[PDB]
Amino acid sequence: KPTETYSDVGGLDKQIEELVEAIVLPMKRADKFKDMGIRAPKGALMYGPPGTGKTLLARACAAQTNATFLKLAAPQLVQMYIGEGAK
Amino acid sequence: LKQTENDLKDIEARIKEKAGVKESDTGLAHPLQVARCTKIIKGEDAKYVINLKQIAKFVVGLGERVSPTDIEEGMRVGVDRSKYNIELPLPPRIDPSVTMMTVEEKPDVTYSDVGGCKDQIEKLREVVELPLLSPERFATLGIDPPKGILLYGPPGTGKTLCARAVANRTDATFIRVIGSELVQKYVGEGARMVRELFEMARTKKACIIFFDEIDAVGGARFDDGAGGDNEVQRTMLELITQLDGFDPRGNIKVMFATNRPNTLDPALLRPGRIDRKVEFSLPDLEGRANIFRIHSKSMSVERGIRWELISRLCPNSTGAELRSVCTEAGMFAIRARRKVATEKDFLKAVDKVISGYKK
């Protein structure tokens, strides 16, 4: 449960509208989608330059729903013995 | 004395070889560079049984125990590459790395080959000289100096004597750590060496921690980022957890040196740690003149020469190329058989650099 809001980083409301729709809505209240029988999306593909809000709004989306932040670094996923990042 | 030490193998060494070998080798098994145990059953509490060799690795479960003095039997106990559970309190930190560490408090270097570098000093005046002198000024500014300072320029020039010139005005402690020597056969030498740098920086305030040749370490490499061993991979942890989180920005500072910024980890190049990028330019007509007049004090020359016209014919040059003008000036005097270098010797030394190189 990191501490962040959506007002700490502004101007991304255009991207936040797509994030809240694909993250906050299927997570917070799922009773609207479960009554229709459809399956809610568990994620959305994100891409962009560093510092553009991809990693800035990560803890923000986790703080709105009060979730644990787990970050997977790319250099940490490559090792010698089979294990580690695979686990 | 010669015959006295010969028979000690039958008398004194019999006890020494028993307590120093047989006890250490008991069961297919004081600086400790190695530890091994084979099939040891001890009732969770002081279990250990850790094989430092990459073959047949072991772990320790069933709770947590802290015994920094003696874990189980003493004797052979080690961590080395992979850190397992409760084995942390006794790391094998012994190593003759003292030849690598160079610590100079308040260096006396002012201007030798750095004459005319005051432009780069102004770049280091605000984010280095200012906090190391009056750190309380940043309280009213609202911001603080960035964590690290990145250096850039020609390879092997400007990253040595220019860093010590700033520490003179601030009376700080300059610690130079060579990155190529951080890489040894011991896995984790790069991360362990960085640990002791912040430990000594907390005792004495206003110290400068300098990392020489960071390209040999960086944030990741093949044997660590792409490999299974952890040395540089654990080195980046000491530059993040310690410096950023625990250590205040005013007293403790970090500076690197590199030929190219892309050779480092893009994770470190992001803001919050590495911000200031200092590019090393070349001395001007006034800067190159003050360097030649200093070298002329230790070299016999003519009293009627002029150092301004010597640096004028030579274009912008590095710190080494300027010292070459003075050293080669004595070579032309050998052909003329003179004890001192006249003005014509310096003119031929400049043309030797212009024509012989053409860079």
Curated annotation (Swiss-Prot), chain A:
It comes from the Eukaryota. N-acetylated by NAT1. Coiled coil: none annotated. The modification Phosphotyrosine is found at residue 6. It is found in: Cytoplasm; Nucleus. ATP binds at residues 48-55. Belongs to the AAA ATPase family. The 26S proteasome is involved in the ATP-dependent degradation of ubiquitinated proteins. The regulatory (or ATPase) complex confers ATP dependency and substrate specificity to the 26S complex. This is 26S proteasome regulatory subunit 6A. It comes from Saccharomyces cerevisiae (strain ATCC 204508 / S288c). The gene is RPT5. The chain holds residues 175 to 261 of 434 of the full protein.
UniProtKB/Swiss-Prot annotation, chain B:
GO terms for molecular function: ATP binding; ATP hydrolysis activity; proteasome-activating activity; ubiquitin protein ligase binding. The N-terminus is blocked. It is found in: Cytoplasm; Nucleus. Keywords: ATP-binding, Cytoplasm, Nucleotide-binding, Nucleus, Phosphoprotein, Proteasome. PROSITE patterns: AAA. ATP binds at residues 153-160. It comes from the Eukaryota. SMART domains: AAA. InterPro entries: 26S_Proteasome_ATPase, AAA+_ATPase, AAA_lid_3, ATPase_AAA_core, ATPase_AAA_CS, NA-bd_OB-fold, P-loop_NTPase, PRS7-like_OB. The modification Phosphoserine is found at residues 67, 134. GO terms for cellular component: cytoplasm; nucleus; proteasome complex; proteasome regulatory particle, base subcomplex. One of its GO terms (biological process) is proteasome regulatory particle assembly. The 26S proteasome is involved in the ATP-dependent degradation of ubiquitinated proteins. The regulatory (or ATPase) complex confers ATP dependency and substrate specificity to the 26S complex. Belongs to the AAA ATPase family. Present with 105 molecules/cell in log phase SD medium. Interacts with UBR1 and CIC1. This is 26S proteasome regulatory subunit 7 homolog.
